[PDB]
Structure 1
Amino acid sequence: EESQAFQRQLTALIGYDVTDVSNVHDDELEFTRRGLVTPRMAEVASRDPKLYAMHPWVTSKPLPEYLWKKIANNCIFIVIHSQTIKVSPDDTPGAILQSFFTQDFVLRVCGRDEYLVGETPIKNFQWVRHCLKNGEEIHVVLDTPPDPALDEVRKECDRKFRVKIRGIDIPVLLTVFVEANIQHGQQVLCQRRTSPKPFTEEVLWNVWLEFSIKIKDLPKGALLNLQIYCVQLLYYVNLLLIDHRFLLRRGEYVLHMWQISGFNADKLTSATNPDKENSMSISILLDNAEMPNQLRKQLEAIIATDPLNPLTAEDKELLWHFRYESLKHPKAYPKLFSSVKWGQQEIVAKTYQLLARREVWDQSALDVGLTMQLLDCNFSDENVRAIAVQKLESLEDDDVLHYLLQLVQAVKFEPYHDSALARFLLKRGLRNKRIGHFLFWFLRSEIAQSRHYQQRFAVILEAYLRGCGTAMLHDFTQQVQVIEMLQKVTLDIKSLSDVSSQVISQLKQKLENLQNPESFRVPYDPGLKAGALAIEKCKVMASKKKPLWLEFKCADPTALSNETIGIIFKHGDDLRQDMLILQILRIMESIWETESLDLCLLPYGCISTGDKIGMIEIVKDATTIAKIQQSTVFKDEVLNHWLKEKSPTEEKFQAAVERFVYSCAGYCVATFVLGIGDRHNDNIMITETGNLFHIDFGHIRVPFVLTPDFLFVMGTTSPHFQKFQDICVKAYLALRHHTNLLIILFSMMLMTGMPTSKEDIEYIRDALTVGKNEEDAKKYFLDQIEVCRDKGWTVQFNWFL
């Protein structure tokens, strides 16, 4: 019937068929599809239609200091379409409108689908704060509120554990054996191997592997991890010993395994390879007083350490024995729940009784860095994860948007498809259209290039789409259609090809043919809508990847400016890594705002849409530093010359120098903390207004980039180089303040986004001077600056080969 065409539309929007049972040895995905219907409706019938439709983008955080200094009269001016209006920072949109009259109309941003509504002071609107920071005028049209009826929803034993390894079978391709582990949160409880047999297209053991753990000592979320060794590891697969119904798993299983490439999240997935034609297969059978002072100081020293500091046996024994003393410190929860012998039923019962009375945790101030630790790979126990999701529950929509991408990624560490974190993301994306849009796109990015997790993400995405609303369904449909057309064009043009006459001819020809998709919401900026193509401005960038440089017209006639919307379609670069780096940059900007800092980072929008294919935003009036040097020529005087050229007034040039010092310090600190500071001059752009910023972080000696050209822009010691060295240490110590959060986000990004062992992660710990006084860390960063000085253009020149 038509309710089936609705499901076909859902499939087309998802990129994967959630009704397909071709790759399932149980009903877990459908069980989760059915279990999600309750939270979906619960959030749908509970959301305010008016505020949901207008989705005001608001924050409760105070107005920073650097933004107060820009309103030196306590008078914000709102231009309504048209007259200007004086307003107080604490003046509500309702008060503003009723003072404009002296009844039902609403103020909507000009050239955007954004609204300044709700019982919030204009001081607390993100659009207003963006205008203030960038010195822009608040233009708004008096429009009629959008119809909430458009968001209407289409209503819907003591015996030891034994495993029979029968054999392996592969029609593809030494000696090979089978290793069967019982993992819980990457903790191997017991391990058993088989005897090494000749590696052939069919190896039968018919062997009972007898484990050391008892049946009733198995914890929920425990994985039977089956791997094949040749000594190297070639194939891996996972089975949930306790399923979504708390039933010990029994029966015959023919599991198609994943192959290894020559640690990361994909090695943990309960999904099996859907390529049953080529993939290796495995066949198995299942049939079954208070402390003294010295110890207190030791325990506090333990709790105080960083997330990456490993716990020794004595440390874990100490944490467990004084578990009730450790429960008073929220900072010790990760290290406390790692000392648990999860392969013992009595100890897990004790752990649950401990979780029973956790007043100090419930009352503690929300700590995101402490929640992420409990949501990462090390914790399989669903109650331990549920306490972290509980702490997330209190985040405002702005903070959810801050950590949305990495929480979506953290969904990969959930043992079961139906998880508290999944339900939280569903609720929060249904409660806000902006969270919903970015959730859609992150889930779709993962569904489109991850066989390990496409099924779970597709179930979640369908659950969301069922409640997001018919209007948003239309929006997403338009966006998907447009991106698909554009990626087809990108791939064809990349096949055809520096640049050829025929290439430009064909590009403009295909763009003219394609335009006959009237308007679509910009995926990386849901406030913006793009209309017709400006074909004259469309080109092929002549990069090694031959990406598409497209420019659109804004479909909103209320838009004041005539600037086009610039997008770059790119195949060849893995843009999931770029998304992760940009999101961490936004997180660093937030950490700096906490201390009234603004290093003017330019985290341009970027969305990964498929395997090594994505889209990138195009910032205003920006060019590469290496290009600036090529123009006039290795020469350091060139950057200030270009700045003078592009800035008309002397005052504008000084403002550009200020902005440059700020953005340069920001990117220096960030790129050092993340280990992507040693960059080619070609991958560092700057805006005509002096704003510097790095690009293309995909697939990525000196600590960072501070070449003598930037220094000449600073003048060298000079009065502004001193400002540089000052802002640097300021922001660096600000980040060291959030050291733990930065480390946990770094490790999660490495696990869920990069090709990743222990050594890779510790670079961030070293760069953040873990266990160092702030003075010594400041001296360390100044030494890094001095290294940048001493090296000069040696590495820059070296790259040229």
Structure 2
Amino acid sequence: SEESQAFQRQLTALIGYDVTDVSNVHDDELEFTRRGLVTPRMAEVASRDPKLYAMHPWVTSKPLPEYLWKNCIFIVIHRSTTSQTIKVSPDDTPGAILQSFFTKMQDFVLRVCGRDEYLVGETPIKNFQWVRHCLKNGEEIHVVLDTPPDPALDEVRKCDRKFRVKIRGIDIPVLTVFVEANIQHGQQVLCQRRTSPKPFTEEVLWNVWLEFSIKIKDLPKGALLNLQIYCVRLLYYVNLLLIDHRFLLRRGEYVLHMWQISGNADKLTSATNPDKENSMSISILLDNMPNQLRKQLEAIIATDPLNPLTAEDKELLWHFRYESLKHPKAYPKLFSSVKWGQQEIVAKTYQLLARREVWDQSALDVGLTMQLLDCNFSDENVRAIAVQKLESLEDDDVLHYLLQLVQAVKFEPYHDSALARFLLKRGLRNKRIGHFLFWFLRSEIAQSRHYQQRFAVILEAYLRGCGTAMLHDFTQQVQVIEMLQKVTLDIKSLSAEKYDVSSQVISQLKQKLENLQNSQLPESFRVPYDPGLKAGALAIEKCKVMASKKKPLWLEFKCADPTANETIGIIFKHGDDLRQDMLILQILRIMESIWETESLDLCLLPYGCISTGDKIGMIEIVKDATTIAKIQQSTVTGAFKDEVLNHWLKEKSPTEEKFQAAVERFVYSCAGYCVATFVLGIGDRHNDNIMITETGNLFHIDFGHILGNRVPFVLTPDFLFVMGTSKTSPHFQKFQDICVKAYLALRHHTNLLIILFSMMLMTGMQLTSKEDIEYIRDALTVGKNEEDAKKYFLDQIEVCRDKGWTVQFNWFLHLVL
């Protein structure tokens, strides 16, 4: 069909990669995966509620916090002229509120004023994320009687002998070298052979038959042939799945283009190097119970995920594997104790999985579930039982772990996978999920040559089922992002390695932007980091180019929603890998959850940020916020003064009653960022990397900088001037009381943070894993008593008092030399 070709052209333009193209494939897995996802796609499309899918009700079914609980409450309503306030009970259906509205006087829906968010469905108003946002921020719930959107807008378009591999030779377009062949399964190497080293040249031939110890029957599905080149240090690498998607053993001649290194999930990839004119290639041929022991494992099951098992541990686990089966928290360690290079053993582990009665009936432990989805596990079925526990996550939580579940796809041996199919369903089922699925996938596709192939096939599958509404919506989003990012770069080319920003460049930018505002960027576009916001025409008289080191584009747009006057602010930066920033910010959001469960709000501000390409993305502008550094520089440039901080809160808050609030907001925002940054290990920043709002909310910025390059956290005397310490004030007591509660509340979800962290460093960081990840263990005091850990953190606080301006004074010296 002529139109099928133009649709595929629209698909490719949205994704960023051509899925139909078969230049960089030596098999058809991707094309087989493309078709595989056709069934699950259409399945969830057929299963989704048209009315609800079109209105995407963002709701939660978790307990309301003890603080937020502090019956019947007011909400304003609207019909152009009418705006009557109504007293509504917490447990009241949105439909019943319409019937309660008829009393004060049938298909008109209660929509949110300002953004495109809806209040529908059979759920209490208390269980809405927008309603809980209004209460917490202390605002007025303003609604408007809009008529529900036509679901028609979301319509869809129709042997036994040993294994041996022959290494023929290696070629490169442009002083000794050998080839290493490793049979891997879950990063663990089963067998290893190496060729005799020959001198480095353009064509190094061997024609060597490399026979391993492994039997063919013993090869586990998901086994990767890791071919590497040395000198001794690793230079090029490339992988080939010994068993394919049709369960077939790989036979035949394979000329594989290898990846070059720069010394990481990027090592596992089955994909081959796209660039053929430059990359090095390789040609190969394929033609084929007592109390002491119980006490013993009770310890092993009880230790952290980063605690390595000895051969003695693993033997113990496997031998009493049925007692190990009775403990959910033992599954990752038990499934590490498996001899995967052994058909006999594996089958037994499968017979073991059939008795999942205890695992199935266990309460969802996300930290445990994902621990089974990292790189330690190549087995499809083990990983399956993980994606199975995930199923009972309500849309609210999926959105908490989407980014990391999406990155987790890199650890999957095959393209088509249970996890992938899960992520496809949950995104087609919920528009918010779908939105972020899109941008997370499109993030990698446009800067990861290692995985863009697999990811494109996933995203393409999604777009074919999301509905023409979002299809068009995504398009006008991508249209604008590219437009702006282009402006960002041309303005970066004018910016030199100078400290100050040009005068002639500010009118240049304006001019450049005035070209776009004329005819190009659509009258409206839905902001990527916040799908609730619909932005429109630029406030060009407020768009500027910041005096930063990277000097990014500061951009402001007007609200396109007429029910809303405050501008939508977006920062466009190039030079910094915003995938790093993306992950940190997301773990921050997860931390707010951990605190909410324990009934705490620590006033964190995880600002919106999405990477849209190669070290280029966008960041949300927090209104009325400025840097701690700039505030020190306003009164004083180096000799910091404690008084300044509290003077700035007085200055920016008129009402004394509003000033007390500002300080209250700060004691929470400070403590929260003190705790978080310390655990994530990025606690030692410069004043310029911490900001505060006029309302008195402190928040950290720029997170790729720190981990991607002493004091526990940034607790300087000026912050202590606000609590009332030169000494322990009634607010500094409030401060530590909070820190402790928060620190402990985080400690209770240790295994979670620990595997998220290790995952982050694997999927989005170029770092020595063994050493780097083991900081988060120490930082949380793994094993130590509650009272013993309590002081440990209070001990960190004292360190900040001991080294008051010591640290910042040094950063000010460093960020100058």
- 1:788 deviation in Å? 1.1
- 1:797 deviation in Å? 1.1
Q: Equivalents in 1 of 2:416, 2:508: separation in Å?
A: 48
> For 1:654-693, what per-residue CA distance to the aligned partner results, in whole angstroms no more than 9, with x for missing partners?
1110110001000000000001000000000011011111
1:138 match: secondary structure: coil
- 1:543 deviation in Å? 1.2
- 1:336 deviation in Å? 0.4
Q: Equivalents in 1 of 2:87, 2:615: separation in Å?
A: 49
- 1:97 deviation in Å? 1.0
The answer to whether the 8 A contact 1:428-1:435 is kept is: yes
The answer to whether the 8 A contact 1:56-1:114 is kept is: yes
1:283 match: secondary structure: strand
Q: Equivalents in 2 of 1:40, 1:506: separation in Å?
A: 47
- 1:78 deviation in Å? 1.0
Q: Equivalents in 2 of 1:699, 1:274: separation in Å?
A: 30
- 1:502 deviation in Å? 1.5
- 1:201 deviation in Å? 1.1
Q: Equivalent residue for 2:785?
A: 773
2:705 match: secondary structure: coil
Matched, 1:207 2:208: yes
Q: Equivalent residue for 1:233?
A: 234
Q: Equivalents in 1 of 2:73, 2:459: separation in Å?
A: 41
Q: Equivalents in 1 of 2:126, 2:563: separation in Å?
A: 23
Bigger mean CA deviation after superposition, 497-506 or 670-679: 497-506
2:349 match: secondary structure: helix
1:66 match: secondary structure: coil
Q: Equivalent residue for 2:760?
A: 749
The answer to whether the 8 A contact 1:493-1:546 is kept is: no
1:699 match: secondary structure: helix
- 1:111 deviation in Å? 1.1
Q: Equivalents in 2 of 1:793, 1:285: separation in Å?
A: 65
- 1:546 deviation in Å? 2.0
Q: Equivalents in 1 of 2:503, 2:310: separation in Å?
A: 66
- 1:473 deviation in Å? 0.4
1:467 match: secondary structure: coil
- 1:488 deviation in Å? 0.3
> For 1:251-282, what per-residue CA distance to the aligned partner results, in whole angstroms no more than 9, with x for missing partners?
101110001102x1001000000010100111
Q: Equivalent residue for 2:278?
A: 278
- 1:699 deviation in Å? 3.1
Q: Equivalent residue for 2:683?
A: 677
Q: Within 5 Å, give how 1:184-195 maps onto structure 2.
A: 184-195=185-196
Alignment partner for residue 552 of structure 2, among 547, 551, 557? Answer: 547
Bigger mean CA deviation after superposition, 27-36 or 74-83: 74-83
Q: Equivalents in 2 of 1:471, 1:208: separation in Å?
A: 56
Q: Equivalents in 2 of 1:37, 1:611: separation in Å?
A: 30
2:167 match: secondary structure: strand
Q: Equivalents in 1 of 2:55, 2:220: separation in Å?
A: 46
> For 1:472-516, what per-residue CA distance to the aligned partner results, in whole angstroms no more than 9, with x for missing partners?
001100000000000000000010122212210111001111012
The answer to whether the 8 A contact 1:320-1:340 is kept is: yes
Q: Equivalents in 2 of 1:299, 1:502: separation in Å?
A: 70
2:464 match: secondary structure: helix
Q: Equivalents in 2 of 1:699, 1:440: separation in Å?
A: 26
Q: Equivalents in 1 of 2:610, 2:102: separation in Å?
A: 42
- 1:698 deviation in Å? 1.1
> For 1:314-342, what per-residue CA distance to the aligned partner results, in whole angstroms no more than 9, with x for missing partners?
10000000000110000000000000000
Q: Equivalents in 2 of 1:389, 1:743: separation in Å?
A: 19
Q: Equivalents in 2 of 1:234, 1:707: separation in Å?
A: 46
Q: Equivalents in 1 of 2:176, 2:235: separation in Å?
A: 12
- 1:158 deviation in Å? 1.6
Q: Equivalents in 1 of 2:529, 2:482: separation in Å?
A: 16
Bigger mean CA deviation after superposition, 790-799 or 485-494: 790-799
The answer to whether the 8 A contact 1:574-1:699 is kept is: no
> For 1:586-626, what per-residue CA distance to the aligned partner results, in whole angstroms no more than 9, with x for missing partners?
00000000000010100000000000000000012110000
1:446 match: secondary structure: helix
Bigger mean CA deviation after superposition, 539-548 or 3-12: 539-548
Q: Equivalent residue for 2:364?
A: 366
Q: Equivalents in 2 of 1:610, 1:519: separation in Å?
A: 22
Q: Equivalents in 1 of 2:165, 2:10: separation in Å?
A: 43
Q: Equivalents in 1 of 2:658, 2:203: separation in Å?
A: 74
How high is the sequence identity, in percent, across the aligned residues? 100
- 1:636 deviation in Å? 1.1
Q: Equivalent residue for 1:247?
A: 248
1:51 match: secondary structure: helix
The answer to whether the 8 A contact 1:160-1:215 is kept is: yes
Q: Equivalents in 2 of 1:169, 1:774: separation in Å?
A: 59
> For 1:365-421, what per-residue CA distance to the aligned partner results, in whole angstroms no more than 9, with x for missing partners?
011000110011000000000000000011000000000000000000000000000
Q: Equivalent residue for 2:161?
A: 159
Structure 1: state its 5+ residue gaps: none
2:25 match: secondary structure: coil
> For 1:520-576, what per-residue CA distance to the aligned partner results, in whole angstroms no more than 9, with x for missing partners?
0000000100000000000001212121000000101111xx100000000011100
- 1:313 deviation in Å? 0.5
The answer to whether the 8 A contact 1:582-1:604 is kept is: yes
- 1:75 deviation in Å? 2.1
Q: Equivalent residue for 2:721?
A: 712
- 1:715 deviation in Å? 1.5
Q: Within 5 Å, give how 1:477-556 maps onto structure 2.
A: 477-497=475-495, 498-516=500-518, 517-556=522-561
The answer to whether the 8 A contact 1:268-1:413 is kept is: yes
- 1:205 deviation in Å? 0.5
1:16 match: secondary structure: coil
Q: Equivalents in 2 of 1:502, 1:464: separation in Å?
A: 45
Alignment partner for residue 734 of structure 1, among 726, 729, 745? Answer: 745
Q: Equivalents in 2 of 1:598, 1:502: separation in Å?
A: 46
2:111 match: secondary structure: strand
The answer to whether the 8 A contact 1:575-1:698 is kept is: yes
> Once superposed, what is the RMSD of the aligned Cα atoms?
0.7
Q: Equivalent residue for 1:398?
A: 396
2:773 match: secondary structure: helix
Q: Equivalent residue for 1:570?
A: 573
Q: Equivalents in 2 of 1:659, 1:108: separation in Å?
A: 30
* TM-score, normalised via structure 1 length: 0.98
Q: Equivalents in 1 of 2:91, 2:601: separation in Å?
A: 23
Q: Equivalents in 2 of 1:664, 1:546: separation in Å?
A: 27
1:67 match: secondary structure: coil
1:95 match: secondary structure: helix
Q: Equivalents in 2 of 1:580, 1:500: separation in Å?
A: 33
- 1:757 deviation in Å? 2.0
The answer to whether the 8 A contact 1:673-1:768 is kept is: yes
> For 1:342-383, what per-residue CA distance to the aligned partner results, in whole angstroms no more than 9, with x for missing partners?
000000000000001110000000110001100110000000
Q: Equivalents in 2 of 1:96, 1:592: separation in Å?
A: 32
Q: Equivalents in 1 of 2:199, 2:287: separation in Å?
A: 28
Runs of 4+ in 1 over 4 A off after TM superposition: none
* TM-score, normalised via structure 2 length: 0.96
Q: Equivalent residue for 2:773?
A: 761
The answer to whether the 8 A contact 1:180-1:224 is kept is: yes
> For 1:78-105, what per-residue CA distance to the aligned partner results, in whole angstroms no more than 9, with x for missing partners?
1001110000011110111110111211
Q: Equivalents in 2 of 1:506, 1:512: separation in Å?
A: 10
Aligned residues: 789
The answer to whether the 8 A contact 1:487-1:569 is kept is: yes
Q: Equivalents in 2 of 1:284, 1:591: separation in Å?
A: 51
Q: Equivalents in 1 of 2:644, 2:98: separation in Å?
A: 51
Q: Within 5 Å, give how 1:407-418 maps onto structure 2.
A: 407-418=405-416
Q: Equivalents in 1 of 2:300, 2:669: separation in Å?
A: 38
The answer to whether the 8 A contact 1:79-1:140 is kept is: yes
> For 1:22-65, what per-residue CA distance to the aligned partner results, in whole angstroms no more than 9, with x for missing partners?
10000000000000000000000110000000000000001111
Alignment partner for residue 77 of structure 2, among 46, 60, 80? Answer: 80
Q: Equivalents in 1 of 2:399, 2:811: separation in Å?
A: 38
- 1:798 deviation in Å? 1.1
Q: Equivalents in 1 of 2:74, 2:382: separation in Å?
A: 49
Alignment partner for residue 810 of structure 2, among 781, 798, 801? Answer: 798
Q: Equivalents in 2 of 1:363, 1:95: separation in Å?
A: 36
Q: Equivalents in 2 of 1:96, 1:180: separation in Å?
A: 67
Q: Equivalents in 1 of 2:321, 2:399: separation in Å?
A: 35
1:361 match: secondary structure: helix
> For 1:192-220, what per-residue CA distance to the aligned partner results, in whole angstroms no more than 9, with x for missing partners?
00111101111000001110110010000
Q: Equivalents in 1 of 2:737, 2:603: separation in Å?
A: 15
> For 1:89-148, what per-residue CA distance to the aligned partner results, in whole angstroms no more than 9, with x for missing partners?
111101111101112110000011100001100000000000010001110000100000
1:758 match: secondary structure: helix
